[PDB]
Design a protein around this nucleic acid. Structure first.
Ligand code: MG
Ligand code: MG
Ligand code: MG
Ligand code: MG
Ligand code: MG
Ligand code: MG
Ligand code: MG
Ligand code: MG
Ligand code: MG
Ligand code: MG
Ligand code: MG
Ligand code: MG
Ligand code: MG
Ligand code: MG
Ligand code: MG
Ligand code: MG
Ligand code: MG
Ligand code: MG
Ligand code: MG
Ligand code: MG
Ligand code: MG
Ligand code: MG
Ligand code: MG
Ligand code: MG
Ligand code: MG
Ligand code: MG
Ligand code: MG
Ligand code: MG
Ligand code: MG
Ligand code: MG
Ligand code: MG
Ligand code: MG
Ligand code: MG
Ligand code: MG
Ligand code: MG
Ligand code: MG
Ligand code: MG
Ligand code: MG
Ligand code: MG
Ligand code: MG
Ligand code: MG
Ligand code: MG
Ligand code: MG
Ligand code: MG
Ligand code: MG
Ligand code: MG
Ligand code: MG
Ligand code: MG
Ligand code: MG
Ligand code: MG
Ligand code: MG
Ligand code: MG
Lengths: 200, 130, 160, 122, 67
RNA sequence: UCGAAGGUGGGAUCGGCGAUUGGGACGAAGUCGUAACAAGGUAGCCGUACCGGAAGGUGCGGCUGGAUC
RNA sequence: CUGGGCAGUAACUGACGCUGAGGAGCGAAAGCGUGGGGAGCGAACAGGAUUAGAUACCCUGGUAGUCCACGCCGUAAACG
RNA sequence: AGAAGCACCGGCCAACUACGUGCCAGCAGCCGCGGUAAUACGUAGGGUGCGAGCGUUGUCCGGAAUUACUGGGCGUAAAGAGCUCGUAGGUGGUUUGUCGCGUUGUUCGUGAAAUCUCACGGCUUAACUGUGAGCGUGCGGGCGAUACGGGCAGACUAGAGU
RNA sequence: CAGCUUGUUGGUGGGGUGACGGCCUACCAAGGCGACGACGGGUAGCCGGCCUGAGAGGGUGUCCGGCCACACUGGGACUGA
């Protein structure tokens, strides 16, 4: 399923904005509910749950998919949180967001779900697809010169580009040199609390 | 009087706890070999065998650090006569995650964990000296 | 610039002539979050004075902990009057796994990879005492090398 | 202790007492629900808990508990019974499902809307 | 046994759980074409076809005769 | 000859009900006593015997998990 | 008449040692069977006294028992 | 434009206000709330978590180191037979030689496939599936060792006995 | 559940089997099994596997795969490799 709900309410509940974009702030403090302006005792489980929910609502990941990602990360050798973050980043919506072909993660998911991207010249419609090394991503030839793409074609130069991805000009092609490093690009959230959450 | 290896370990542990600077016990070849291993590992100082009224007695001198500090952290017999402990090369026991030494009785003689792993032959883990 | 967490808070009662007398004891664990940890029992009429006394006692009783790169060197098994908690080194990827008191003490000390379990009593004070005792029997490879000789009979693949 | 003695006489896990004796293997058992009445719980509750004598298809007679605000129960009735503890009554260890073959869902139910029986709206 | 002998055999097998080494004694029936064997009389046995209803061993040789 | 099934007989074992009857657990705000916790008003327990509405009492032997000079 | 222990010499054998499932023996007092004995004490029982009651504590008595012989019983806070 | 609901909000454990009620209606896994200001009852709003699923029931594992080899205790919390002897059994002083049964190493055969894991390949992805290697804790056979236990043959006096 | 067995244990000579064999038969011996639990009672398809557990372990044998046992109940023969 999908959230399809107020992102700002979730941001106020989590006490940390994680979407930005045009609607970054609500010009007000964060009482998410009727009693949201009252102070609450910070329990140990609360911090870990809030961190996990922040990550899940930042990357648009359902609970079961996040569970699978975490279990794959911990089962993989080396670290666990870094592998989990790398798996989360390897999603098509995140890759499009980092390459600046969409306004936010929700826009990237909308476009990839509606099927406006051919990775190796092949139609896909799943944001759950994971990129790999030496993998190309290309835009549908028919879908070019459309409004949702031409609106960002000229104003996609504001957000930075990560050190693992690269973008192409007038004809955009997205290529994956190697796996990302979220620990050094765009880590607003500590995974060492999620790894402790998931071991309870 | 069963398990003279255990008796030797218990005597050494008691003397180390009581800050004794000298121990005495009847001598055996196994105890002499264990003393050699301990001296090589550096947990003890020199040892010698002296002829008592009956048989021979093996003598171990202990070592202490700068303050009244004991080089020997503790002792623990492993292969009790009630249940023998045998270990192979692929699964040799680890003491203190490598900071401890376990005596291994293999066909090459009495050997430490790392040396026995180097030559790939296992046996009976006498004790942990760590 | 210290990190503090309270472990247990409870109210005691002592019978007096006219009625009831109450007091508050609150154990507080204080540290800088890298290698320093402090334990303070504390006791006063009011909770603020109690936790202040606990913080002061922790500052007084600060003690050194041996680290090898975010985790302990070798597994340890401490024992308090009644608490029984064992600590084991873990992979750097793994976080901190412990109960309330043990996790609080470890995070105030500054350990990032540790496997802890309680096997004795479940009293918070005794669990804290067992954990800090295990931290005390924790030794350094350089110290054991000074004790024996030839600082080569040790494994530190992480190094640094 | 004494590995030889352990070899001679090994360890044994604690004895176990089953909790679904009346159902004897069924999460829900279809009963008869005869003689619906009301009793009083333990001393520091002072209530009037609605109970019934329901005999299952497994042919056992137990006293069950009726949750919700009122009931349409009567003499022998086509009911379903599930397990549950009441913590106030002496020996009531089963609960009748509300919204079953015969009994109706509890009317005016808006919160939790599944227990005691409640359709959303229609 | 009128051309048969009964021989006690023992073996040691490690306990599956406790790990102690224990000794268990068995009993087999061995064929003796010429019945010359007394109490004790250590014998090495090699196992054959089903010579009888309960005989699956035959006499090989006599070693370490009874004291 | 053997041989399924069946009949006859004395037994073996496992359950259900049973007039009547013994002890147990829980209930309420009942009746009769105060045996224990203070030297609890005759110190308390342990084994046995006897007695009495009941708790209990007495004798024999032992312990302090009580005290005394 | 008989058991055990300790000390000394090392005189002698030469691991013949430790524990011990079951099993066996011993095992306070009270009690049981058979015969004897019975001073004193003393359950049960009786009378007196206290008390609302007193099937008790106190007093006066008093049976088995406590004792011996041979058996039985195998139980104690048989506890360091 | 044709498409979302579900459970909980006192501690365990993330989620509070008001209305009606006043040991009654009632809820509940424990302990505890309701007998006139209920974050615990029914309701309204608000919040939390999940999602075409969410809660209850049924059973198993874990927490439980409360059957403890790993990984428990037995003076007073549950736990040393009333004591002794002794059958089987378990266990055993120093030293020499032999065997190599236990022990351990190598090699060979076997330990089916799928399924468990690493690494890849294909269904737009995943589930699903194919391949290479681990797994298959073991067993049988040959070839190396006697450091310890053990079998045999001896020796000593310290144990023990006289 | 503390004593179980008499073709039962063994041997001999025949018979029988594709094949060894009390598998069957005639004769001889008194033997064979049991506290490491026979005999008796309750329960149950076994395994590769599945679940939980850090692990050891605890639970389980359903998809699928290997085998075994059965075809209304009980018993029997024949054809045929
Ligand atoms: Mg889904
Ligand atoms: Mg505990
Ligand atoms: Mg144990
Ligand atoms: Mg023959
Ligand atoms: Mg009746
Ligand atoms: Mg009284
Ligand atoms: Mg009295
Ligand atoms: Mg009185
Ligand atoms: Mg009194
Ligand atoms: Mg009387
Ligand atoms: Mg008495
Ligand atoms: Mg007396
Ligand atoms: Mg001599
Ligand atoms: Mg003895
Ligand atoms: Mg005995
Ligand atoms: Mg007497
Ligand atoms: Mg008499
Ligand atoms: Mg007489
Ligand atoms: Mg009278
Ligand atoms: Mg009198
Ligand atoms: Mg008199
Ligand atoms: Mg009489
Ligand atoms: Mg007697
Ligand atoms: Mg005595
Ligand atoms: Mg909470
Ligand atoms: Mg109200
Ligand atoms: Mg509510
Ligand atoms: Mg459980
Ligand atoms: Mg367990
Ligand atoms: Mg315990
Ligand atoms: Mg007591
Ligand atoms: Mg006790
Ligand atoms: Mg005793
Ligand atoms: Mg006793
Ligand atoms: Mg007794
Ligand atoms: Mg013996
Ligand atoms: Mg012996
Ligand atoms: Mg020896
Ligand atoms: Mg022996
Ligand atoms: Mg693929
Ligand atoms: Mg395989
Ligand atoms: Mg081999
Ligand atoms: Mg002597
Ligand atoms: Mg015959
Ligand atoms: Mg014949
Ligand atoms: Mg069956
Ligand atoms: Mg565990
Ligand atoms: Mg059939
Ligand atoms: Mg049919
Ligand atoms: Mg049939
Ligand atoms: Mg044919
Ligand atoms: Mg034919």
């Amino acid at each position: 399923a999908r959230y399809t709900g107020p992102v700002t309410r979730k941001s106020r509940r989590l006490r940390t904005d994680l979407v930005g974009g045009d609607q970054a702030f609500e010009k007000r403090p964060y009482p998410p509910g009727q009693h949201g302006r009252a102070r609450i005792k910070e329990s140990e489980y609360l911090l870990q749950l809030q961190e996990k929910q922040k990550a899940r609502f930042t990357y648009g990941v359902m609970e079961k998919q996040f569970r699978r990602y975490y279990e794959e990360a911990v089962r993989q050798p080396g670290k666990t949180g870094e592998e989990l973050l790398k798996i989360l980043e390897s999603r098509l919506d995140n890759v499009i967001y980092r390459a600046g072909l969409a306004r936010t993660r929700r826009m990237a998911r909308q476009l990839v779900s509606h099927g406006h991207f051919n990775v190796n010249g092949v139609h896909v419609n799943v944001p759950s697809y994971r990129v790999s090394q030496y993998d190309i991503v290309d835009v549908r030839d028919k879908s070019l010169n459309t409004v949702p793409f031409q609106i960002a074609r000229e104003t996609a130069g504001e957000r930075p580009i990560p050190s693992w991805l690269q973008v192409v000009g007038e004809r955009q092609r997205v290529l994956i040199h190697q796996l990302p490093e979220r620990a050094q690009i765009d880590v607003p959230l500590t995974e060492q609390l999620i790894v402790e959450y998931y071991s309870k | 009087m069963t398990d003279p290896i255990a008796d030797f370990l218990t005597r050494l542990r008691n003397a180390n706890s009581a800050y004794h600077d000298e121990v005495s016990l009847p001598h055996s070849k196994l105890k002499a070999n264990i003393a050699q291993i301990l001296k090589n590992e550096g947990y003890i100082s020199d040892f010698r065998t002296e002829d008592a009224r009956v048989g021979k007695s093996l003598v171990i001198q202990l070592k202490y650090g700068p303050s009244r500090e004991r080089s020997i952290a503790g002792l623990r017999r492993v292969s009790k006569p009630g249940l023998r402990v045998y270990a192979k090369s692929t699964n040799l026991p680890r003491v203190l995650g490598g900071l401890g030494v376990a005596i291994i009785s293999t066909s090459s003689g009495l050997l430490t964990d790392r040396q026995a792993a180097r030559q790939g032959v296992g046996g009976e883990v006498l004790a942990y000296v760590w | 610039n210290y990190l503090e967490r309270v472990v247990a808070i409870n109210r005691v009662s002592k019978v007096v002539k006219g009625g009831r007398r109450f007091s508050f004891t609150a154990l507080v664990i204080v540290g800088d979050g890298n290698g320093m940890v402090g334990v303070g029992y504390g006791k006063a009429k009011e909770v603020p004075a109690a936790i202040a006394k606990g913080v002061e006692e922790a500052r007084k009783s600060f003690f050194r902990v041996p680290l090898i790169g975010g985790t302990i060197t070798h597994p340890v098994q401490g024992e308090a009057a009644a608490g029984v908690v064992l600590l084991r080194p873990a992979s750097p990827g793994t976080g901190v796994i412990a109960g309330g008191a043990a996790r609080a003490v470890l995070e105030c000390a500054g350990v990032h990879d540790i496997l802890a379990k309680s096997l004795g009593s479940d009293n918070a004070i005794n669990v804290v005492h067992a954990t800090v005792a295990a931290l005390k029997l924790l030794q350094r490879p350089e110290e054991v090398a000074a004790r024996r000789g030839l600082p080569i009979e040790d494994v530190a693949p992480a190094g640094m | 202790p004494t590995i030889q003695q352990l070899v001679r006489k090994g360890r044994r896990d604690k004895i176990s007492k089953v909790k679904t004796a009346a159902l004897k293997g069924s999460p829900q058992r279809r009963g008869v629900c005869t003689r619906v009445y009301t009793t009083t719980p333990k001393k520091p509750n002072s209530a009037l808990r609605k109970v019934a004598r329901v005999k299952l298809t497994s042919q056992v007679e137990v006293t069950a508990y009726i949750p919700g605000e009122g009931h349409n129960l009567q003499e022998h009735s086509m009911v379903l019974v599930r397990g549950g503890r009441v913590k106030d009554l002496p020996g009531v260890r089963y609960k009748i499902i509300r919204g079953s073959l015969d009994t109706q869902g509890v009317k005016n139910r808006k919160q939790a809307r599944s227990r005691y029986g409640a359709k959303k709206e229609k | 046994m009128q051309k048969t002998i009964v021989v006690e055999l023992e073996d040691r097998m490690r306990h599956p759980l406790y790990g102690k080494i224990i000794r268990t004694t068995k009993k087999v029936k061995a064929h003796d074409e010429d019945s010359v064997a007394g109490i004790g009389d250590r014998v090495s046995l090699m196992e054959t076809r089903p010579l009888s209803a309960t005989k699956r061993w035959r006499l090989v040789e006599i070693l370490e005769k009874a004291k």
